[PDB]
Design a protein around this ligand. Structure first.
Ligand code: NA
Length: 226
C-alpha cells in the first residue's frame, strides 16, 4: 500500500556499518540502487578504515529485504515494504560452525528518497587461524533461501536460514542465521504466512578500485505460496 508504492521504481540505497570482530574494528560504506519490480540490487561497498578484517562474503547477509520481488499474489505477505517509510529493526545472530558468531542490529528506513541500512555488528569467539579471521574463504557466494514466519508478539517476523561459504580447500563454512525484524513505527504491518525468499548473488571487483571493497549484484524473489 503506502509502503509498496515507495518501491515501484529505482531507489538509491546507502549502507553504513560499524563492526568489531574479536576487537578488530572496522567500518563499511555502501552505495547503490534497488529495483524491487525485478528484485534487483546493485551495490558497491568500501571498507573505509583500511583492510577488512573478515572476508567480504561473511558480511553479505548483514549488508535490505524490502527490495525482494513479491509476486502480485503474494503482496499481502510483504512485511518489509509494509513497514516503510518509518522502517524496521533487523537483528541477527550468525553462528559460524566451529568458530565465532556475529550479532547484528540494523535500522532500515527511508531518509528522503533514499533507503538506508544503518548497522552495528559485533563478533566474538572467533579463532585467529580459523576460516574467518584467517581469510580462507573464496570470494564468491552461493544461492540462498531465507525462511520467513510471522512473529505476532513483536508485530514482526522471524527468519532463519543457512549460508554455506566456500572454503579455499573445497570445503564449506556453515553460517547459521537467526533473524528478527520489528517495525520502528507503530503503523500496521503485513504479518505473513510462512514463505521464503530465493536469492542469487554475484560478487566482483572494480578493477580501478584500490581500496578494499566488494561489488554485489543480487536478485531476490519471494516464493512458497500458491
Ligand atoms: Na566467553
Amino acid at each position: 500500500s503506502k509502503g509498496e508504492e515507495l518501491f515501484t521504481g529505482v531507489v538509491p540505497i546507502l549502507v553504513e556499518l560499524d563492526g568489531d570482530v574479536n576487537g578488530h574494528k572496522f567500518s563499511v560504506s555502501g552505495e547503490g540502487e534497488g529495483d524491487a519490480t525485478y528484485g534487483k540490487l546493485t551495490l558497491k561497498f568500501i571498507c573505509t578504515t583500511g583492510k577488512l578484517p573478515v572476508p567480504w562474503p561473511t558480511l553479505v547477509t548483514t549488508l535490505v529485504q524490502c527490495f525482494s520481488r513479491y509476486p502480485d499474489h503474494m503482496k499481502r505477505h510483504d512485511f518489509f515494504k509494509s513497514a516503510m517509510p518509518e522502517g524496521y529493526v533487523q537483528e541477527r545472530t550468525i553462528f559460524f560452525k566451529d568458530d565465532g558468531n556475529y550479532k547484528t542490529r540494523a535500522e532500515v528506513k527511508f531518509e528522503g528518497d533514499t533507503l538506508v541500512n544503518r548497522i552495528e555488528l559485533k563478533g566474538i569467539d572467533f579463532k585467529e587461524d580459523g576460516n574467518i579471521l584467517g581469510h580462507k574463504l573464496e570470494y564468491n557466494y552461493n544461492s540462498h533461501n531465507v525462511y520467513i514466519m510471522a512473529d505476532k508478539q513483536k508485530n514482526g517476523i522471524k527468519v532463519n536460514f543457512k549460508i554455506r561459504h566456500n572454503i579455499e580447500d573445497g570445503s564449506v563454512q556453515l553460517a547459521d542465521h537467526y533473524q528478527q525484524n520489528t517495525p520502528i513505527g507503530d503503523g500496521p504491518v503485513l504479518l505473513p504466512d510462512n514463505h521464503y525468499l530465493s536469492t542469487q548473488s554475484a560478487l566482483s571487483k572494480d578493477p580501478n578500485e584500490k581500496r578494499d571493497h566488494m561489488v554485489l549484484l543480487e536478485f531476490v524473489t519471494a516464493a512458497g505460496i500458491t
